[PDB]
From Swiss-Prot:
Gene source species: Escherichia coli (strain K12)
Sequence positions that bind 3-phosphoshikimate: K22, S23, R27, S169, S170, Q171, S197, D313, N336, K340
Binding site for phosphoenolpyruvate: K22, G96, R124, Q171, R344, R386, K411
Any GO MF annotation of the entry: 3-phosphoshikimate 1-carboxyvinyltransferase activity
GO biological process: amino acid biosynthetic process; aromatic amino acid family biosynthetic process; chorismate biosynthetic process
Residues the UniProt record annotates as site (Modified by bromopyruvate): C408, K411
Activity regulation details: Competitively inhibited by glyphosate. Inhibited by (S)- and (R)-phosphonates analogs of the tetrahedral reaction intermediate. Inhibited by (R)-difluoromethyl analogs of the tetrahedral reaction intermediate. Inhibited by bromopyruvate.
Pfam families noted in UniProt: EPSP_synthase (PF00275)
InterPro entries linked: Enolpyruvate_Tfrase_dom (IPR001986), Enolpyruvate_Tfrase_sf (IPR036968), EPSP_synthase (IPR006264), EPSP_synthase_CS (IPR023193), RNA3'P_cycl/enolpyr_Trfase_a/b (IPR013792)
PROSITE patterns registered for this protein in UniProt: EPSP_SYNTHASE_1, EPSP_SYNTHASE_2
Functional pathway: Metabolic intermediate biosynthesis; chorismate biosynthesis; chorismate from D-erythrose 4-phosphate and phosphoenolpyruvate: step 6/7
Protein name: 3-phosphoshikimate 1-carboxyvinyltransferase
PANTHER family: AROM/DEHYDROQUINATE SYNTHASE, PENTAFUNCTIONAL AROM POLYPEPTIDE
Protein backbone atom coordinates (compact mmCIF):
# COMPACT_ATOMS: atom_id res chain seq x y z
CA UNK A 1 0.00 0.00 0.00
CA UNK A 2 1.12 3.63 0.06
CA UNK A 3 3.81 4.73 2.51
CA UNK A 4 6.03 7.71 3.20
CA UNK A 5 9.47 7.45 4.82
CA UNK A 6 10.68 10.45 6.82
CA UNK A 7 14.41 10.94 7.15
CA UNK A 8 15.87 12.24 10.45
CA UNK A 9 15.17 15.96 10.97
CA UNK A 10 18.11 17.73 12.60
CA UNK A 11 16.23 20.86 13.70
CA UNK A 12 12.86 22.54 13.22
CA UNK A 13 12.49 26.31 13.00
CA UNK A 14 10.05 28.51 11.18
CA UNK A 15 6.48 29.69 10.81
CA UNK A 16 3.41 27.79 9.70
CA UNK A 17 0.16 29.48 8.68
CA UNK A 18 -2.39 26.99 9.99
CA UNK A 19 -5.09 25.30 7.92
CA UNK A 20 -8.59 26.20 9.17
CA UNK A 21 -10.18 24.55 12.22
CA UNK A 22 -12.24 21.42 11.40
CA UNK A 23 -14.46 21.91 14.46
CA UNK A 24 -15.23 25.52 13.63
CA UNK A 25 -15.56 24.87 9.89
CA UNK A 26 -18.25 22.20 10.09
CA UNK A 27 -20.28 24.07 12.74
CA UNK A 28 -20.10 27.32 10.67
CA UNK A 29 -21.18 25.54 7.50
CA UNK A 30 -24.25 23.91 9.06
CA UNK A 31 -25.29 27.10 10.85
CA UNK A 32 -24.73 29.15 7.67
CA UNK A 33 -26.95 26.66 5.79
CA UNK A 34 -29.73 26.93 8.36
CA UNK A 35 -29.43 30.73 8.66
CA UNK A 36 -31.15 33.55 6.89
CA UNK A 37 -28.88 35.56 4.61
CA UNK A 38 -25.55 35.02 2.88
CA UNK A 39 -22.54 34.00 4.95
CA UNK A 40 -19.00 34.36 3.58
CA UNK A 41 -16.59 32.08 5.47
CA UNK A 42 -12.85 32.65 5.03
CA UNK A 43 -9.96 30.40 6.16
CA UNK A 44 -12.42 27.45 5.87
CA UNK A 45 -10.59 24.10 6.10
CA UNK A 46 -10.36 22.00 2.92
CA UNK A 47 -10.18 18.42 4.25
CA UNK A 48 -12.24 15.25 3.99
CA UNK A 49 -14.46 15.99 6.96
CA UNK A 50 -15.38 19.42 5.60
CA UNK A 51 -15.83 18.08 2.06
CA UNK A 52 -18.36 15.51 3.40
CA UNK A 53 -20.33 18.35 5.05
CA UNK A 54 -20.20 20.43 1.83
CA UNK A 55 -21.39 17.41 -0.21
CA UNK A 56 -24.28 16.81 2.20
CA UNK A 57 -25.32 20.46 1.97
CA UNK A 58 -25.22 20.19 -1.85
CA UNK A 59 -27.39 17.06 -1.71
CA UNK A 60 -29.87 18.79 0.60
CA UNK A 61 -30.24 21.61 -1.92
CA UNK A 62 -28.14 24.32 -0.29
CA UNK A 63 -26.47 26.77 -2.71
CA UNK A 64 -22.88 27.91 -2.21
CA UNK A 65 -19.67 28.69 -4.07
CA UNK A 66 -16.07 27.88 -3.18
CA UNK A 67 -12.89 29.73 -4.06
CA UNK A 68 -10.16 27.91 -5.99
CA UNK A 69 -8.36 26.74 -2.87
CA UNK A 70 -11.65 25.86 -1.18
CA UNK A 71 -10.93 28.09 1.83
CA UNK A 72 -13.48 30.79 0.98
CA UNK A 73 -17.15 29.79 0.87
CA UNK A 74 -20.17 31.97 0.15
CA UNK A 75 -23.27 30.19 1.43
CA UNK A 76 -26.86 31.16 0.58
CA UNK A 77 -28.72 30.43 3.83
CA UNK A 78 -31.86 28.29 3.64
CA UNK A 79 -33.65 30.41 6.22
CA UNK A 80 -34.78 27.42 8.25
CA UNK A 81 -34.48 23.63 8.71
CA UNK A 82 -33.09 21.69 5.74
CA UNK A 83 -35.24 19.15 3.99
CA UNK A 84 -35.13 16.09 1.80
CA UNK A 85 -37.30 13.02 1.38
CA UNK A 86 -37.15 9.68 -0.41
CA UNK A 87 -34.65 8.21 2.05
CA UNK A 88 -31.93 10.38 0.40
CA UNK A 89 -28.61 8.91 1.51
CA UNK A 90 -25.94 11.32 2.81
CA UNK A 91 -22.48 9.69 2.97
CA UNK A 92 -20.49 11.33 5.75
CA UNK A 93 -17.17 9.49 5.62
CA UNK A 94 -15.87 9.26 9.17
CA UNK A 95 -16.79 12.83 10.07
CA UNK A 96 -18.26 13.03 13.56
CA UNK A 97 -18.79 16.78 13.16
CA UNK A 98 -21.08 16.08 10.19
CA UNK A 99 -22.68 12.86 11.43
CA UNK A 100 -23.66 13.92 14.93
CA UNK A 101 -24.85 17.47 14.09
CA UNK A 102 -26.78 16.42 10.98
CA UNK A 103 -28.41 13.47 12.84
CA UNK A 104 -29.95 16.03 15.18
CA UNK A 105 -30.59 18.88 12.76
CA UNK A 106 -32.37 16.82 10.14
CA UNK A 107 -34.91 15.66 12.80
CA UNK A 108 -36.55 19.12 12.50
CA UNK A 109 -39.89 18.99 10.69
CA UNK A 110 -40.56 15.99 8.51
CA UNK A 111 -37.81 14.42 6.47
CA UNK A 112 -36.89 10.97 5.24
CA UNK A 113 -33.09 10.88 5.07
CA UNK A 114 -30.45 8.23 5.68
CA UNK A 115 -27.06 9.08 7.21
CA UNK A 116 -24.20 6.65 6.66
CA UNK A 117 -20.42 6.63 6.25
CA UNK A 118 -17.27 4.57 6.14
CA UNK A 119 -17.13 1.20 7.88
CA UNK A 120 -15.49 2.69 10.99
CA UNK A 121 -18.29 5.25 11.34
CA UNK A 122 -20.75 2.36 11.63
CA UNK A 123 -18.72 1.34 14.74
CA UNK A 124 -18.75 4.79 16.37
CA UNK A 125 -21.54 5.29 18.93
CA UNK A 126 -24.50 7.55 18.40
CA UNK A 127 -27.07 5.97 20.73
CA UNK A 128 -26.90 8.67 23.38
CA UNK A 129 -27.80 11.22 20.76
CA UNK A 130 -30.59 9.13 19.25
CA UNK A 131 -32.07 8.54 22.74
CA UNK A 132 -32.17 12.27 23.41
CA UNK A 133 -33.65 13.15 20.01
CA UNK A 134 -36.42 10.53 20.52
CA UNK A 135 -37.24 12.05 23.92
CA UNK A 136 -37.80 15.30 21.99
CA UNK A 137 -40.12 13.60 19.50
CA UNK A 138 -37.86 12.40 16.71
CA UNK A 139 -38.53 9.21 14.75
CA UNK A 140 -35.16 7.51 14.11
CA UNK A 141 -34.41 3.98 12.91
CA UNK A 142 -31.12 2.05 13.22
CA UNK A 143 -30.65 0.36 9.82
CA UNK A 144 -27.84 -1.90 11.05
CA UNK A 145 -26.48 -2.19 14.59
CA UNK A 146 -28.55 -0.69 17.39
CA UNK A 147 -26.83 2.49 18.77
CA UNK A 148 -24.71 3.10 15.63
CA UNK A 149 -25.05 4.68 12.15
CA UNK A 150 -26.50 4.19 9.64
CA UNK A 151 -29.68 6.00 10.68
CA UNK A 152 -32.97 6.66 8.87
CA UNK A 153 -34.34 10.03 10.09
CA UNK A 154 -38.06 10.69 9.68
CA UNK A 155 -38.35 13.93 11.59
CA UNK A 156 -40.50 14.97 14.50
CA UNK A 157 -38.18 16.72 16.97
CA UNK A 158 -40.39 19.36 18.55
CA UNK A 159 -38.41 20.06 21.74
CA UNK A 160 -39.37 19.53 25.37
CA UNK A 161 -37.50 17.94 28.32
CA UNK A 162 -34.53 16.01 26.93
CA UNK A 163 -31.89 14.13 28.90
CA UNK A 164 -28.58 13.36 27.21
CA UNK A 165 -25.63 11.26 28.35
CA UNK A 166 -22.44 13.33 28.13
CA UNK A 167 -20.00 10.61 29.24
CA UNK A 168 -18.93 9.31 25.83
CA UNK A 169 -19.03 12.26 23.44
CA UNK A 170 -19.64 15.98 23.74
CA UNK A 171 -20.73 15.87 20.09
CA UNK A 172 -24.17 14.57 21.05
CA UNK A 173 -24.80 17.66 23.26
CA UNK A 174 -23.31 19.89 20.56
CA UNK A 175 -25.75 18.44 18.03
CA UNK A 176 -28.70 18.99 20.36
CA UNK A 177 -27.66 22.56 21.16
CA UNK A 178 -27.44 23.57 17.52
CA UNK A 179 -30.80 21.96 16.68
CA UNK A 180 -33.05 22.90 19.61
CA UNK A 181 -33.32 26.65 18.92
CA UNK A 182 -35.19 25.89 15.66
CA UNK A 183 -37.66 23.44 17.26
CA UNK A 184 -41.16 24.85 17.84
CA UNK A 185 -41.24 24.16 21.58
CA UNK A 186 -38.74 25.22 24.26
CA UNK A 187 -36.14 22.60 25.22
CA UNK A 188 -34.43 21.88 28.51
CA UNK A 189 -31.40 19.63 27.97
CA UNK A 190 -30.29 17.86 31.14
CA UNK A 191 -26.85 16.17 31.26
CA UNK A 192 -27.25 12.79 32.93
CA UNK A 193 -23.90 12.73 34.66
CA UNK A 194 -20.37 13.51 33.52
CA UNK A 195 -19.60 15.60 30.47
CA UNK A 196 -16.41 14.84 28.58
CA UNK A 197 -14.62 17.18 26.17
CA UNK A 198 -16.28 20.19 27.73
CA UNK A 199 -14.24 22.78 25.78
CA UNK A 200 -15.98 21.70 22.56
CA UNK A 201 -19.31 22.77 24.03
CA UNK A 202 -17.87 26.26 24.41
CA UNK A 203 -16.96 26.22 20.69
CA UNK A 204 -20.57 25.28 19.83
CA UNK A 205 -22.06 28.03 21.96
CA UNK A 206 -19.58 30.57 20.55
CA UNK A 207 -20.63 29.66 17.00
CA UNK A 208 -24.35 29.72 17.88
CA UNK A 209 -23.94 33.21 19.32
CA UNK A 210 -22.12 34.41 16.17
CA UNK A 211 -25.16 33.16 14.25
CA UNK A 212 -27.56 35.05 16.53
CA UNK A 213 -28.66 32.55 19.16
CA UNK A 214 -27.95 32.36 22.87
CA UNK A 215 -29.10 29.82 25.43
CA UNK A 216 -29.00 29.46 29.21
CA UNK A 217 -26.06 27.32 30.33
CA UNK A 218 -26.53 26.18 33.94
CA UNK A 219 -23.06 24.98 35.01
CA UNK A 220 -22.75 22.65 32.00
CA UNK A 221 -25.33 20.38 33.69
CA UNK A 222 -28.51 21.79 32.18
CA UNK A 223 -29.17 23.94 29.13
CA UNK A 224 -32.33 25.99 28.66
CA UNK A 225 -33.20 26.72 25.04
CA UNK A 226 -36.08 28.84 23.79
CA UNK A 227 -37.74 27.42 20.71
CA UNK A 228 -38.96 29.22 17.60
CA UNK A 229 -35.64 30.93 16.94
CA UNK A 230 -33.84 31.54 13.65
CA UNK A 231 -30.12 31.69 12.87
CA UNK A 232 -28.92 34.86 11.15
CA UNK A 233 -25.89 35.22 8.88
CA UNK A 234 -22.99 37.12 10.55
CA UNK A 235 -21.92 38.43 7.17
CA UNK A 236 -18.25 37.64 6.81
CA UNK A 237 -16.75 35.20 9.28
CA UNK A 238 -13.10 34.22 9.78
CA UNK A 239 -12.58 30.58 10.74
CA UNK A 240 -9.78 30.17 13.29
CA UNK A 241 -6.67 28.21 12.33
CA UNK A 242 -6.77 24.65 13.70
CA UNK A 243 -5.25 24.31 17.18
CA UNK A 244 -5.17 20.51 17.01
CA UNK A 245 -3.23 20.70 13.70
CA UNK A 246 -0.95 23.17 15.41
CA UNK A 247 0.04 20.69 18.12
CA UNK A 248 2.41 18.73 15.91
CA UNK A 249 4.47 21.79 14.99
CA UNK A 250 4.63 23.23 18.52
CA UNK A 251 5.66 19.82 19.84
CA UNK A 252 8.29 19.46 17.12
CA UNK A 253 9.95 22.66 18.41
CA UNK A 254 9.69 21.43 22.00
CA UNK A 255 11.63 18.34 20.90
CA UNK A 256 14.00 19.67 18.26
CA UNK A 257 13.88 23.45 17.93
CA UNK A 258 14.59 26.11 17.30
CA UNK A 259 11.42 28.20 17.49
CA UNK A 260 8.26 27.27 15.58
CA UNK A 261 5.48 29.86 15.32
CA UNK A 262 1.99 28.92 14.18
CA UNK A 263 -0.34 31.64 12.99
CA UNK A 264 -4.11 31.70 12.89
CA UNK A 265 -4.64 31.00 16.60
CA UNK A 266 -3.68 33.00 19.65
CA UNK A 267 -4.51 33.69 23.26
CA UNK A 268 -8.12 34.60 22.51
CA UNK A 269 -8.91 31.49 20.48
CA UNK A 270 -12.08 29.59 21.32
CA UNK A 271 -10.47 26.18 20.73
CA UNK A 272 -9.63 24.22 23.81
CA UNK A 273 -6.58 22.70 22.14
CA UNK A 274 -4.62 25.91 22.52
CA UNK A 275 -4.17 24.54 26.06
CA UNK A 276 -1.80 21.98 24.51
CA UNK A 277 0.82 24.77 24.66
CA UNK A 278 0.40 24.81 28.47
CA UNK A 279 1.34 21.11 28.55
CA UNK A 280 4.53 21.75 26.55
CA UNK A 281 5.36 24.53 29.01
CA UNK A 282 4.84 22.13 31.93
CA UNK A 283 7.25 19.73 30.21
CA UNK A 284 9.93 22.41 29.93
CA UNK A 285 9.41 24.17 26.62
CA UNK A 286 9.16 27.94 26.24
CA UNK A 287 5.88 29.34 24.91
CA UNK A 288 5.12 32.80 23.51
CA UNK A 289 1.58 33.99 22.97
CA UNK A 290 0.31 36.55 20.52
CA UNK A 291 -3.06 37.81 19.30
CA UNK A 292 -2.76 35.69 16.17
CA UNK A 293 0.10 33.28 16.86
CA UNK A 294 1.50 30.85 19.40
CA UNK A 295 5.18 29.93 19.32
CA UNK A 296 7.25 27.26 21.01
CA UNK A 297 11.00 27.32 21.63
CA UNK A 298 13.05 24.33 22.70
CA UNK A 299 13.87 24.22 26.40
CA UNK A 300 13.89 20.94 28.34
CA UNK A 301 11.47 18.06 27.96
CA UNK A 302 10.37 16.31 31.14
CA UNK A 303 7.63 13.69 31.52
CA UNK A 304 4.24 14.73 32.92
CA UNK A 305 1.29 12.87 34.51
CA UNK A 306 -1.92 14.70 33.66
CA UNK A 307 -5.66 14.33 33.18
CA UNK A 308 -6.10 15.12 29.44
CA UNK A 309 -9.88 15.09 29.16
CA UNK A 310 -9.92 18.75 28.16
CA UNK A 311 -7.67 18.15 25.09
CA UNK A 312 -8.28 14.59 23.86
CA UNK A 313 -7.07 15.15 20.32
CA UNK A 314 -3.94 17.24 20.92
CA UNK A 315 -3.13 14.90 23.86
CA UNK A 316 -2.20 12.21 21.35
CA UNK A 317 0.69 14.45 20.30
CA UNK A 318 2.05 14.31 23.86
CA UNK A 319 2.06 10.49 23.58
CA UNK A 320 4.73 10.56 20.85
CA UNK A 321 6.50 13.63 22.26
CA UNK A 322 6.90 11.50 25.42
CA UNK A 323 9.36 9.38 23.48
CA UNK A 324 11.77 12.32 23.80
CA UNK A 325 11.08 13.27 27.39
CA UNK A 326 12.94 12.42 30.58
CA UNK A 327 10.90 9.99 32.65
CA UNK A 328 7.58 8.14 32.28
CA UNK A 329 4.62 10.11 30.92
CA UNK A 330 1.04 9.26 31.91
CA UNK A 331 -2.07 10.64 30.14
CA UNK A 332 -5.29 10.04 32.10
CA UNK A 333 -9.04 10.28 31.66
CA UNK A 334 -9.03 9.62 27.94
CA UNK A 335 -11.42 6.71 27.59
CA UNK A 336 -13.17 8.04 24.53
CA UNK A 337 -9.95 7.71 22.54
CA UNK A 338 -11.44 4.19 22.12
CA UNK A 339 -14.48 5.32 20.14
CA UNK A 340 -12.92 7.77 17.71
CA UNK A 341 -11.20 7.44 14.30
CA UNK A 342 -9.83 4.17 15.63
CA UNK A 343 -9.48 2.83 19.16
CA UNK A 344 -6.63 5.28 19.83
CA UNK A 345 -5.52 3.76 23.16
CA UNK A 346 -4.97 0.40 21.47
CA UNK A 347 -3.42 1.97 18.36
CA UNK A 348 -1.10 4.41 20.18
CA UNK A 349 0.16 1.72 22.56
CA UNK A 350 0.76 -0.76 19.75
CA UNK A 351 2.70 1.64 17.57
CA UNK A 352 4.69 3.25 20.39
CA UNK A 353 6.00 -0.19 21.33
CA UNK A 354 7.19 -0.73 17.77
CA UNK A 355 9.72 2.13 18.08
CA UNK A 356 10.98 0.85 21.44
CA UNK A 357 8.83 2.31 24.20
CA UNK A 358 7.51 0.35 27.17
CA UNK A 359 3.78 1.13 27.32
CA UNK A 360 0.99 0.29 29.69
CA UNK A 361 -2.32 0.50 27.85
CA UNK A 362 -4.75 1.37 30.65
CA UNK A 363 -8.51 1.15 30.24
CA UNK A 364 -8.72 4.95 30.05
CA UNK A 365 -5.10 6.04 30.33
CA UNK A 366 -1.71 5.39 28.77
CA UNK A 367 1.72 5.24 30.51
CA UNK A 368 4.81 5.62 28.33
CA UNK A 369 8.42 4.93 29.25
CA UNK A 370 10.80 5.86 26.45
CA UNK A 371 13.64 3.65 25.28
CA UNK A 372 17.26 4.81 25.53
CA UNK A 373 17.15 5.09 21.76
CA UNK A 374 14.36 4.74 19.22
CA UNK A 375 14.46 2.10 16.52
CA UNK A 376 13.04 2.04 13.03
CA UNK A 377 9.41 0.98 12.52
CA UNK A 378 6.82 0.92 9.78
CA UNK A 379 3.89 2.62 11.53
CA UNK A 380 0.31 1.44 10.92
CA UNK A 381 -2.13 4.37 10.87
CA UNK A 382 -5.57 2.80 11.31
CA UNK A 383 -7.27 5.20 8.84
CA UNK A 384 -6.54 7.85 11.48
CA UNK A 385 -5.03 11.19 10.43
CA UNK A 386 -3.62 11.72 13.96
CA UNK A 387 -1.77 8.45 14.09
CA UNK A 388 0.16 9.55 10.98
CA UNK A 389 0.77 13.05 12.28
CA UNK A 390 1.77 11.96 15.77
CA UNK A 391 4.26 9.38 14.53
CA UNK A 392 5.84 11.78 12.09
CA UNK A 393 7.57 13.17 15.23
CA UNK A 394 9.62 9.95 15.52
CA UNK A 395 11.81 11.44 12.76
CA UNK A 396 13.01 14.17 15.14
CA UNK A 397 15.41 11.44 16.35
CA UNK A 398 18.40 9.68 14.78
CA UNK A 399 16.14 7.13 13.10
CA UNK A 400 13.95 7.46 10.01
CA UNK A 401 10.33 6.22 10.32
CA UNK A 402 7.99 4.86 7.64
CA UNK A 403 4.34 5.96 7.89
CA UNK A 404 1.76 3.75 6.17
CA UNK A 405 -1.13 5.41 4.25
CA UNK A 406 0.16 8.98 4.77
CA UNK A 407 -2.81 10.35 2.85
CA UNK A 408 -5.02 9.53 5.80
CA UNK A 409 -3.92 12.93 7.16
CA UNK A 410 -6.41 14.46 4.68
CA UNK A 411 -9.24 13.91 7.18
CA UNK A 412 -8.19 17.27 8.70
CA UNK A 413 -4.85 18.26 7.16
CA UNK A 414 -4.10 17.26 3.53
CA UNK A 415 -0.85 19.24 3.42
CA UNK A 416 0.55 17.99 6.69
CA UNK A 417 3.82 16.54 5.43
CA UNK A 418 4.65 19.47 3.20
CA UNK A 419 4.14 21.75 6.23
CA UNK A 420 6.31 19.62 8.56
CA UNK A 421 8.94 19.69 5.77
CA UNK A 422 8.73 23.51 5.58
CA UNK A 423 10.06 23.79 9.13
CA UNK A 424 12.48 20.84 8.89
CA UNK A 425 16.13 21.95 8.59
CA UNK A 426 19.25 19.94 8.09
CA UNK A 427 21.37 22.31 10.17
O1 LIG B 1 -17.02 18.79 18.61
C1 LIG B 1 -15.93 18.72 18.01
O2 LIG B 1 -15.59 19.49 17.10
C2 LIG B 1 -15.00 17.63 18.42
C3 LIG B 1 -15.12 17.09 19.72
C4 LIG B 1 -14.24 15.98 20.21
O3 LIG B 1 -15.06 14.73 20.33
P1 LIG B 1 -15.68 14.01 21.79
O4 LIG B 1 -16.63 14.96 22.34
O5 LIG B 1 -16.35 12.77 21.31
O6 LIG B 1 -14.45 13.85 22.62
C5 LIG B 1 -12.99 15.82 19.35
O7 LIG B 1 -12.32 14.65 19.78
C6 LIG B 1 -13.36 15.77 17.86
O8 LIG B 1 -12.21 15.54 17.08
C7 LIG B 1 -13.99 17.14 17.50
Amino acid sequence: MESLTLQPIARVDGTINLPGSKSVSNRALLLAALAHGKTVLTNLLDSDDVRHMLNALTALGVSYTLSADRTRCEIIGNGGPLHAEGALELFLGNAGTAMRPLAAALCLGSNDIVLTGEPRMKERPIGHLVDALRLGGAKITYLEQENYPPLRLQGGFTGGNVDVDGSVSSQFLTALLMTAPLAPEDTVIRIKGDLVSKPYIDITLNLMKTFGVEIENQHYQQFVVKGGQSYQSPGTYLVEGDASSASYFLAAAAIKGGTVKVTGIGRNSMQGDIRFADVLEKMGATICWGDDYISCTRGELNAIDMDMNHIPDAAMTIATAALFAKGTTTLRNIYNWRVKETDRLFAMATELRKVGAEVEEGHDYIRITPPEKLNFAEIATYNDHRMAMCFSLVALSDTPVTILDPKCTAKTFPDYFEQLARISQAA
